[PDB]
Enzyme design. Structure first.
Site, short mmCIF file in Angstrom:
data_model
loop_
_atom_site.label_atom_id
_atom_site.label_comp_id
_atom_site.label_asym_id
_atom_site.label_seq_id
_atom_site.Cartn_x
_atom_site.Cartn_y
_atom_site.Cartn_z
N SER A 1 -6.47 2.42 3.35
CA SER A 1 -5.72 1.64 2.33
C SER A 1 -6.66 0.78 1.48
O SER A 1 -6.51 -0.45 1.40
CB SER A 1 -4.65 0.75 2.99
OG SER A 1 -3.87 1.48 3.93
N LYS B 1 0.39 3.48 -2.86
CA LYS B 1 -0.73 4.37 -3.00
C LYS B 1 -0.25 5.81 -3.18
O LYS B 1 -0.97 6.66 -3.76
CB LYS B 1 -1.72 4.20 -1.88
CG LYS B 1 -2.53 2.89 -2.09
CD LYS B 1 -3.61 2.75 -1.00
CE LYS B 1 -4.48 1.53 -1.35
NZ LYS B 1 -3.70 0.33 -1.20
N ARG C 1 4.49 -1.03 13.49
CA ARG C 1 5.15 -0.24 12.44
C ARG C 1 5.27 1.21 12.91
O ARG C 1 6.33 1.81 12.81
CB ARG C 1 4.41 -0.31 11.09
CG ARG C 1 4.32 -1.72 10.49
CD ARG C 1 3.22 -1.85 9.40
NE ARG C 1 1.87 -1.50 9.86
CZ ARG C 1 0.81 -1.42 9.07
NH1 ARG C 1 0.91 -1.66 7.77
NH2 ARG C 1 -0.38 -1.09 9.57
N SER D 1 0.80 -1.23 0.00
CA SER D 1 0.00 0.00 0.00
C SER D 1 0.84 1.29 0.00
O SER D 1 0.27 2.37 -0.18
CB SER D 1 -0.98 0.04 1.19
OG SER D 1 -2.12 -0.76 0.91
#
Ligand code: NA
Ligand code: NA
Ligand code: NA
EC number: 3.5.2.6
Lengths: 237, 237
Positions: free
Chosen positions: B94, B49, B222, B46
């Site tokens: 996402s 994106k 993350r 993602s």
């Protein structure tokens, strides 16, 4: 328009008086604790940085949000003012001297014409060209602030789309997984302001608030009381 | 470039392994816990994106951040996907199907030419035009992510300025009185990503991190690990 006097408890809780105005964009509906004060006009003080920024960008007085406004070498009481700035920090710290310079370069004729194009408040710039929004003739009400902000949000003002996007970036105040607030504070020795909007996933809530501010003691209340209203209406968690 | 193995403490403390890469824009200096993993290229997932949005905007496949992408009526596992979206919500959640549609409209030829103009990763779009960033040929390293992001931050990518400003608005993740983060998460079965930057009053810190992600359990790490590193480096309080 709907009046909700229960918001007054938030003001009472803080020994204060004022108005909060909310606009639900999807529903095209307004809410306030005090319809009369919602339509009473006051000096904008530093909330004027929103139109001033737009005009300065559109005229090229400001290039972009990175350009450096060099400190003029006069030390002033507010420590953050005594340094170089850009549009982001000038807005964040409400750095009056930088905007006064902008106003002088803009000049009264272009300033007056632009505020008229913007339909901004009473559109009166009388007094000093570099201080009318602090001690001059210009007045705007909380509902008028909302009308102006709605146009800004939709890129409907009579400046370039680019100038409007840049000012909305500079208005960024808070953001998390639940909401985004773009807004500007102001205060004049009698009145304190907070105007702006809350972006949600599927709606936008415009707000404008002002409160009697005899001393700077209570400046934090401008956001706190507003947030209490936002919490009560479930706009923010 | 400087290697700081002390950051490994943040990964091991979470029974994890990965890399965080920081770039101090003012000083033009970089820092990482693992110089080699910093240059290891992975599927972007993602995080793709970001270029996909830029291209779709520049070609008019996306009008702006308000345009509605109507749900195609197929129900997918992630609840947030099964509704209408705009660029802001599509990025925030996402929403892969919307971007897959963008990719099909962009088409292979324009996609390939734009990634080459972007100097993006290995620039390889084999094979599926609407899935190559999830299972195809394209690979990008954390250092390559930083190079691309620095160009985006300065509006130096070869697309309109407007396109870049809109995508940077859509990247907005967090903001307060101390910092602003603009970023994009990504994850495939094997690795998870977080890339973006931290805007301070007087500096920008670019970051790119990736970590081993055997399960989707750990996806919160993350951001958390990245923030522990930023906290250690005194970038955020
Ligand atoms: Na409207
Ligand atoms: Na309170
Ligand atoms: Na840790």
């Amino acid at each position: 328009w709907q009046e909700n006097k229960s918001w007054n408890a938030h003001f009472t809780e803080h020994k204060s008086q004022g108005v909060v105005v909310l606009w639900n964009e999807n529903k095209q509906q307004g809410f306030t604790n005090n319809l009369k004060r919602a339509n009473q006009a006051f000096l904008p003080a530093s909330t004027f940085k929103i139109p001033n920024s737009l005009i300065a960008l559109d005229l090229g007085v400001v290039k972009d949000e990175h350009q450096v406004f060099k400190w003029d070498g006069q030390t002033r009481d507010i420590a953050t003012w005594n340094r170089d700035h850009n549009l982001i920090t000038a807005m964040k710290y409400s750095v009056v001297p930088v905007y006064q310079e902008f106003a002088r370069q803009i000049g009264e004729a272009r300033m007056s014409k632009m505020l008229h194009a913007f339909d901004y408040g009473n559109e009166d710039i009388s007094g000093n060209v570099d201080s009318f929004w602090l001690d001059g003739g210009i007045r705007i009400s909380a509902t008028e602030q909302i009308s102006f902000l709605r146009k800004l949000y939709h890129n409907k003002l009579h400046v370039s789309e680019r100038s409007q996007r840049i000012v909305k970036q500079a208005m960024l105040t808070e953001a998390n997984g639940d909401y985004i607030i773009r807004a500007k504070t102001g205060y004049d020795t009698k009145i304190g302001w907070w105007v702006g909007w809350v972006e949600l996933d599927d709606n936008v809530w415009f707000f404008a608030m002002n409160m009697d501010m005899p001393t700077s003691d209570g400046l934090g209340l401008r956001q706190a009381i507003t947030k209490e209203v936002l919490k009560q209406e479930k706009i923010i968690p």
